[PDB]
Amino acid sequence: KIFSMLEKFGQFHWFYGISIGQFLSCFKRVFIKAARTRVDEILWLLYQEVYCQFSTALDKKFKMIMAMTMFCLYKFDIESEQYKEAVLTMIGVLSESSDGVPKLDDLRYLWDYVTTKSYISALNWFKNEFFVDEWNIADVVANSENNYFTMASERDVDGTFKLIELAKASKESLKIIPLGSIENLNYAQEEISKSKIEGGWILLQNIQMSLSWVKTYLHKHVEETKAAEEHEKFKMFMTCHLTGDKLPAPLLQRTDRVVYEDIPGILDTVKDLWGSQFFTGKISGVWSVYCTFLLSWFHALITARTRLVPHGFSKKYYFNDCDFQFASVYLENVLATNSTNNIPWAQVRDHIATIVYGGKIDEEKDLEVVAKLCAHVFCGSDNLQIVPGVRIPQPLLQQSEEEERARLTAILSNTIEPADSLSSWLQLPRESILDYERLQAKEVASSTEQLLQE
């Protein structure tokens, strides 16, 4: 039954298929490592090992669906019938397909979660009360004998720095080699050859950029060979994108697949933007660092809003570091060419909301919301609240670049992000995010019902 559920998972998307040898290896890993008896302890260990092996190959929705389906499959054979009736009643309430009070100790907390409209808490109820283990990236790479890893993610989200952190924690040198041109293809070929003959990690960015290499070169590379040379701490990585064109399926089948989720910490991404900026230019620090701070905040609130597809925007847009760079150079130019310090913030607002950040956008309401965000960020007033928690003072006329940089870093550091960062900080109604959570819950529960009805 669980193999049928995983095959139905593979039916939904190209990246979610499984093989059979992987399933058998995961099954034997149950025994290679008392629930009132010994056979039920074996069954519990089997479920936990299978879930921790096949949970990291999915996004949040598919892994949460798998967790709740596995819990239902456990309970519907060990627990009594009224438990199944209550579970289906509450799931039907979750998907807005069935109505009725459940027949009533952990289910009391589940009902409290459901009546409070905290749907991710209802999923955490499954994932915590049943499963007592979770696997991260290091757990996946440590607990696999394979040498190929596919780490896919949505656009405007990258986990290359995560692999860099892992390599630094593993005392192993990571080589980052992007693709995009035939020179990049030649560099990738020579680098992967040097790695295969000598050693050292290689990570390729966006092989989907070289999907031609996927069908011809990579297919002849990975499929036409056995397991590589058993070097010490030597592995090969690869990343892709979930929302684009499908890659070759056998290459997916011959490698361990990992799906990396986002890091939508708004204060965290403000810190990430601020700490990677080496401030230099004609305007040292009198206003360039302040404008870069405002631009880092603006890029943070605009790259976090694009994660909420039906509510934050009207379409899944993608904003990246190049947009930040062009906005930065525009701010540098307008600040350099207007030294009277009566800075025309209207010019910056219009040029950001029409050309720099309004270029790729098509709909009018999304232009409106980007204009609203830029007006809130680049208002250029004496005192402004970038969020309801932080107030930013304008630079005074008696500081250097170092003092202002330290002051802005201190203003960033003492901030603590609240738990409603996706609601309070992006200036969104709580009703809209509650409706988005409800729609997510309905989709998840309907998928669970469709899985369990077959």
């Binding site: 950029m209 190049c322 010019q347 040029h351």
Partner: protein, 1411 residues
């Protein structure tokens, strides 16, 4: 080997590459060789290649030619460095340019703005723009013989740049000294005046911006606008273009200043001034070419000072300036600009305008155009430094998309890094820092290309402001209200009308309306009237009837406003040519106005609406109106190939041979007789709109008006040479040609059914040769339109095979009635008026019957006879004139016993005589005839019978397939083309007309029938046909390829139904009498066998329908097969009795009918017993079971019923002999196999017996066929499986014919792999053989030798060869598992189904599996 002297005579004798080198050298010596000192390095290469060419003129020689080609390519690559504009030109174009004395017309490709070079006494003085503007150099360049081509090209380019700079400096000096623009506009080019006006505007706005005042310079620029608008009408054409393209910029200046004046705060004004483009001038730098830079939203770009001429200038809108600022922001950091959105938003035009505004000519690419031209153009742009505009970039092919995306990524990487050299096309090319790359999109950009660009989305621009300022340019009093009205109308037109694929109402059609309004506003005056008339003349021709109603209603709603000589001329032209209405008048006026305003139209509508009548009558009205001598050409495009249409040059030699369209254009351009001063020449292309055929005239249809030929020649199209396209639908048409060319849409018929009936009769009398006037009045009075309209409307209720409208069959009716009445001319002088009226009415009645009821069933024919008679069944006229019946004309025939097996013998029944007589009547009317019906009904048979027994027509034997007729016709006709006989006409028997797949040959038949002639492809001449007719026979709706109505409309359609039960009984009664003359003692039983046969046939037809199994089709051909089998049994048997006869009939009926069955065999046994009991109550009949009826001649010298034991013992002995001599298979021998092999042997003994076997795998069909073939002494042939199939078929035919080898061909389902093989065996099995599959002459002479060893004309020779190849050839088709699509196509194919006998071996039953 030919004769060498450059020029080569009789080239059709490595040689291909050699003569390609010969042609390239012919061009090279004709341009450089025979103009030479203008390229010294190329002269040295010319001498070296001359040595090599004289050496060759063979592997070393071929290597030398390849090295010479590489040397020429390397010489061009060296011409890149020192010049880089040849990349807009091909290799031969570059060679002829380096070959400016007497050379021009290529500078438009490499520059983009100039048209011709002005010369004076071997010295360059200036260049002329495309739009006629005159450029004057600062210093005249003296041209000498020894200067290199690149040298004077470079000095000309630098002189153009410096002259533009000097004229701009002088213009700015004049403007700053108070001289007004309308004095300096008459001296210098438009670019210099434009740049000076822009710089002066920027300076004045900036100077008045330092304080708060705007009204002074606003009033100044308003007065300057008014002055230019007043000076516009009093200027020449080039000055008119200058004033217009400057007044648009002055409107832009007024718009910007008016927006700045309305700003409440100075900060808002500074914002808006930063948003608008600015033009400054540096007065410190000494370098002249960089003295002007570009300011937009703070960023800076540099001018390049390239000549632009006076191109079409985009109207300045806020969206346009936002796009300009986006491109500025992208190009500041050396990126590129990417545009996307819906189509018709102005992406290519905003890129062109942004490049134009900086004084640099952008390079625009269109996509649909291979990789090589893209790479060459990119290299040229990156070397020059121009800008890259990839239009329809999403439409490019994926491989070239990846290649050009890699190239663009390399360009952008070089621009970001600032590389001095770029590595493109495997060469280190210099990369200028002034280059740019722009892409426009309608999907999205690839991500590797998306990362390096700035995607920007535009909507439809402010068409209101565009139209307002365009109307303001031409001088309308109320531009804004008219612009709002017209843009509102275009929006409502795109919203309310139907979603037809050619209804385009974007900005391009609005621009076309504004462009076309100019001659009309000059002729009628400004206001709402001129714009509404231009809107009508542009939009009305392309709308449908309800579309026209919506158009009329809305146009009357929004707009206030609501030549009799040309009406008289159209009426006179229609009366002279015999044509004959409100809709016809409206379409005539519409076409008149398009041909007044547009130079190229397409004609489209339903088939037979009067498109040819419309354009012919308007051309005749043009002849009588304008006084011009009119010549008209009508061309069928698809009958000829595209290469034959537009000039066939053999790629082997690259030698030009003229085409018919090429010859027409050469005659037009030459103008030998000088009659072209008052001659308008029309070429009408009357076929469907193939995009491949029509895209060769893309420049011809557009404003270029120049014909592009493959060899490089450029023949111009004069304004009086207009091209028409007659088609039926807009399915396979791109919107580019739809908006590019005017479209006239015939939504419905023009009616005039009363007026239509006269033109047919009048041209019928005109085509011929006291009583004539009387007969004309009688026919006209009998043609009462009141009754005829009701009859025509009631005729639609009948079912029509090959459904053609009632308006499109009146040609057949009128022609047949007139021919029948003319045929009785000599017997009209001695009869009363009443009998004449009755005879004329009856003949018209017959013609109307055979026209409006031909394509219907016999029951439907009788129903229409009854209804029309109330508005006889077999009425006729016999030789005074009297009324008689068809039944009295039936003759009697008594054939021999052995004359049954001849397939060419028919038995004349009532329907046979009726069909033969009407076939003669329609054939003598010179009208095409198509007979439709179920297979086996007798279409081909009745045509062969009607054609062989007549002394007025001859037979041409042509066989068709999926893939000619005129090839055999060349051997029967004489060249005008005439029949070889001087008495009998010739008629084209074209069988299996559904077989060609979609079609050229059907349009060739339409050309032969409609225009009565064809164009000779190798001679490019028109030949007229005198006495050739065309006939055919198929059933389209039951074919497992429907035809265009444009072909079947010109031919008469009659339905040929199955013979009735009484007719079948009579004909096979005569057949039974013929075969019973062999045994005369049983001649009294002829009627019961005939009635039993026809009853069994109709019972099997009703019972075993095709709804059960696909191959369950029964046709009266099976009855002829049964009679032939009975004759072969009787002739090869001993003295029989009544029991022997009834058992033979039962066995043969079982074999013919039941062998297709797999329960069904038990049902057939019951049916056979029932028929025997009902019709033949004879004593001890029996022998109706499968195992009770065993007939064979394998045991003795004669055919007789056998016992089981001797048969099985003999077959076991023969099978053990087979195993000891042939291949050994462990076969178990059972009763069903014995029954099967008995039926196979009885099928194989029959002359021309072919067969196909259906059954499950490992049932043993092939092994039993091989065994019976060895038993029957035939020669086995196994296909060792298109060229191989063709050669094995030819080997089989040749071995069967020249050696008299009786062959059995076993073709399995695994042998066929493509539809070509299926078509080949379909052709081979339809008739006796396929002669299509010096070899023909060798076969003919060997045929003559064989015939003389064992007839003079080719007809009798061909018939004898066909009989010989039919008698000694048998083919067996092994097919299994009919569920396969290929197997089902093979079984259901009409050609293979009819000739072969269907055998379903089926699956094993319980009993047979038991033993």
């Amino acid at each position: 080997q030919y004769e060498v002297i450059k020029l080569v005579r009789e080239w059709d004798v490595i040689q291909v590459n050699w003569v390609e080198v010969q042609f390239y050298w012919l061009d090279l010596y004709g341009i450089l060789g025979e103009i030479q000192n203008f390229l010294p390095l190329e002269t040295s290469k010319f001498k070296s290649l001359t040595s090599e060419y004289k050496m060759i003129t063979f592997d070393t020689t071929l290597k030398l030619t390849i090295d010479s080609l590489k040397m020429i390519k390397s010489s061009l690559s060296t011409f890149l460095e020192r010049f880089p504009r040849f990349y807009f030109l091909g290799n031969d174009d570059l060679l002829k340019i380096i070959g400016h004395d007497q050379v021009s017309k290529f500078m438009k490709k490499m520059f983009g703005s100039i048209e011709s070079i002005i010369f004076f006494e071997d010295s360059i003085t200036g260049v002329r723009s495309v739009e006629g503007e005159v450029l004057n150099l600062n210093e005249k360049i003296e041209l000498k013989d020894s200067i290199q081509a690149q040298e004077w090209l470079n000095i000309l380019d630098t002189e153009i740049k410096l002259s533009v700079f000097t004229q701009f400096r002088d213009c700015l000096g004049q403007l700053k000294d108070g001289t007004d623009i309308e004095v300096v506009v008459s001296k210098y080019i438009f670019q210099a005046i434009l740049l000076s006006a822009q710089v002066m505007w920027t300076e004045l706005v900036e100077k008045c911006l330092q304080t708060n005042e705007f009204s002074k310079y606003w009033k100044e620029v308003d007065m300057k606008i008014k002055g230019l608008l007043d000076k516009l009408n009093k200027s020449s054409d080039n000055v008119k273009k200058k004033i217009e393209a400057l007044l648009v910029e002055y409107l832009h200046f007024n718009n910007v200043i008016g927006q700045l004046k309305n700003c409440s705060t100075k900060e808002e004004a500074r914002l808006l001034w930063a948003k608008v483009q600015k033009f400054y001038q540096k007065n410190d730098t000494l370098d002249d070419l960089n003295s002007v830079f570009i300011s937009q939203s703070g960023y800076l770009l540099q001018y390049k000072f390239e000549y632009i001429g006076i191109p079409e200038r985009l109207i300045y809108t806020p969206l346009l300036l936002v796009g300009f600022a986006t491109l500025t922001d992208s190009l500041h950091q050396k990126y590129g600009g990417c545009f996307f959105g819906p189509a018709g938003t102005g992406k290519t035009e905003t890129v062109k305008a942004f490049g134009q505004n900086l004084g640099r000519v952008v390079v625009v690419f269109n996509c649909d155009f291979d990789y090589q031209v893209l790479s060459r153009l990119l290299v040229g742009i990156t070397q020059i430094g121009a800008w890259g505009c990839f239009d329809e970039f999403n439409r490019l092919d994926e491989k070239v998309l990846s290649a050009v995306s890699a190239n663009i990524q390399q360009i952008q990487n070089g621009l970001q890094v600032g590389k001095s050299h770029i590595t493109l096309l495997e060469e280190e090319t210099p990369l200028s820092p002034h280059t740019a790359v722009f892409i426009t999109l309608n999907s999205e950009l690839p991500e590797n290309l998306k990362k390096s660009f700035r995607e920007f989305s535009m909507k439809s621009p402010q068409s209101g402001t565009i139209a307002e300022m365009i109307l303001q340019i031409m001088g309308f009093e109320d531009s804004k209200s008219l612009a709002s009205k017209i843009v509102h109308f275009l929006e409502l037109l795109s919203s309310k009308c139907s979603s037809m694929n050619h209804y385009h109402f974007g900005l391009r059609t609005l621009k076309g309306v504004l462009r076309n309004c100019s001659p009309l506003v000059s002729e009628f005056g400004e206001g709402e009237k001129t714009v509404v008339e231009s809107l009508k003349r542009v939009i009305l021709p392309s709308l449908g009837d309800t579309d026209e109603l919506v158009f009329k209603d809305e146009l009357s709603k929004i707009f206030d406003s609501a030549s009799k000589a040309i009406v008289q001329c159209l009426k006179d032209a229609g009366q002279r040519s015999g044509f004959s209405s409100e809709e016809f008048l409206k379409k005539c006026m519409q076409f008149y106005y398009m041909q007044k305003t547009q130079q190229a139209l397409i004609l489209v509508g339903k088939a037979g609406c009067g498109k040819t009548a419309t354009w012919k009558t308007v051309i005749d009205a043009m002849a009588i109106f304008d006084g011009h001598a009119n010549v008209v050409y009508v061309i069928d495009t698809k009958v000829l190939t595209k290469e034959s249409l537009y000039g066939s040059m053999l790629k082997a030699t690259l030698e030009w041979r003229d085409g018919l369209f090429t010859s027409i254009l050469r005659r037009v351009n030459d103008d030998i007789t000088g009659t072209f001063k008052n001659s308008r020449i029309w070429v009408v292309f009357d076929s469907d709109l193939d995009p491949e055929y029509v895209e060769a005239m893309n420049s011809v249809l557009d404003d270029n008006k120049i014909l592009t030929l493959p060899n490089g020649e450029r023949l111009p199209i004069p304004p009086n040479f207009r091209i028409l396209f007659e088609t039926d639908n807009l399915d396979h048409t791109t919107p580019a040609t739809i908006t590019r060319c005017g479209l006239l849409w015939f939504s419905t018929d023009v009616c005039s059914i009363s007026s239509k009936i006269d033109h047919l009769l009048n041209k019928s009398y005109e085509a011929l040769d006291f009583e004539l006037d009387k007969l004309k009045d009688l026919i006209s009075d009998s043609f009462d339109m009141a009754s005829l309209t009701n009859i025509f409307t009631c005729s639609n209720d009948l079912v029509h095979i090959l459904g053609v409208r009632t308006f499109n069959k009146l040609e057949t009716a009128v022609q047949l009635a007139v021919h029948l009445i003319s045929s009785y001319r000599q017997w009209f002088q001695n009869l009363d008026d009443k009998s004449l009226k009755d005879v004329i009415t009856l003949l018209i009645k017959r013609s109307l019957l055979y026209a409006l009821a031909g394509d219907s069933t016999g029951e439907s024919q009788r129903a229409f006879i009854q209804t029309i008679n109330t508005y006889s069944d077999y009425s006729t006229i016999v030789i005074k004139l009297s009324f008689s019946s068809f039944c009295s004309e039936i003759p009697s025939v008594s054939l021999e016993a052995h004359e049954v097996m001849r397939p060419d013998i028919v038995i004349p029944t009532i329907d046979t005589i009726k069909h033969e007589k009407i076939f003669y009547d329609l054939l003598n009317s010179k009208r095409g005839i198509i007979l439709c019906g179920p297979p086996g009904s007798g279409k081909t048979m009745i045509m062969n019978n009607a054609l062989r027994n007549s002394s007025l027509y001859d037979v041409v034997g042509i066989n068709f397939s999926k893939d000619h007729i005129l090839s055999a016709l060349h051997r029967h006709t004489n060249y005008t083309l005439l029949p070889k006989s001087d008495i009998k006409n010739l008629v084209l028997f074209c069988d299996e007309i559904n077989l060609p797949k979609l079609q050229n040959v059907v349009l060739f038949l339409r050309q032969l029938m409609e225009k009565q002639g064809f164009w000779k492809t190798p001679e490019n001449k028109w030949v007229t046909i005198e006495r050739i007719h065309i006939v055919g026979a198929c059933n389209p709706p039951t074919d497992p390829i429907p035809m265009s109505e444009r072909f079947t409309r010109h031919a008469a359609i009659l339905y040929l139904g199955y013979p009735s039960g009484k007719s079948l009984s009579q004909i096979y009664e005569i057949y039974y009498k013929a075969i019973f003359k062999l045994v005369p003692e049983f001649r009294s039983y002829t009627e019961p066998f005939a009635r039993a046969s026809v009853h069994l046939y109709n019972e099997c037809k009703a019972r075993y329908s095709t709804g059960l199994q696909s191959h369950y089709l029964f046709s009266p051909r099976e009855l002829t097969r049964l009679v032939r089998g009975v004759y072969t049994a009787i002739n090869t048997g001993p003295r029989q009795t009544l029991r022997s006869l009834i058992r033979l009939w039962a066995y043969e009926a079982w074999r013919i009918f039941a062998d297709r069955l797999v329960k069904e065999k038990n049902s057939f046994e019951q049916l056979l017993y029932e028929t025997v009991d009902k019709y033949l109550p004879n004593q001890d009949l029996g022998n109706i079971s499968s195992t009770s009826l065993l007939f064979s001649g394998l045991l003795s010298l004669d055919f007789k019923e056998v016992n089981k034991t001797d048969l099985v013992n003999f077959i076991e002995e023969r099978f053990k002999t087979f195993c000891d001599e042939e291949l050994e298979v462990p076969m178990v021998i059972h009763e069903s196999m014995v029954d099967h092999i008995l039926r196979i042997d009885r099928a194989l003994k029959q002359v021309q017996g072919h067969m196909m076997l259906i059954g499950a795998s490992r049932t043993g069909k092939t092994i039993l066929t091989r065994f019976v073939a060895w038993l029957n002494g035939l020669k086995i042939v196994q296909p060792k499986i298109l060229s191989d199939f063709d050669m094995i078929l030819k080997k089989a035919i040749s071995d069967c014919s020249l050696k008299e080898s009786r062959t059995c061909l076993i073709i399995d389902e695994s042998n066929i792999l493509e539809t070509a093989f299926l078509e080949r065996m379909n052709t081979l099995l339809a008739n006796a053989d396929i002669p299509d599959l010096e070899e023909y002459d060798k076969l003919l002479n060997n045929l003559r030798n064989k015939t003389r060893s064992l007839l003079d004309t080719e007809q009798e020779l061909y018939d004898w060869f066909v009989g010989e190849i039919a008698k000694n050839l048998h083919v067996v088709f092994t097919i299994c598992d009919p569920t396969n699509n290929k197997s089902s196509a093979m079984i259901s194919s009409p050609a293979l189904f009819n000739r072969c006998i269907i055998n379903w071996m089926g699956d094993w039953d319980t009993k047979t599996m038991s033993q």
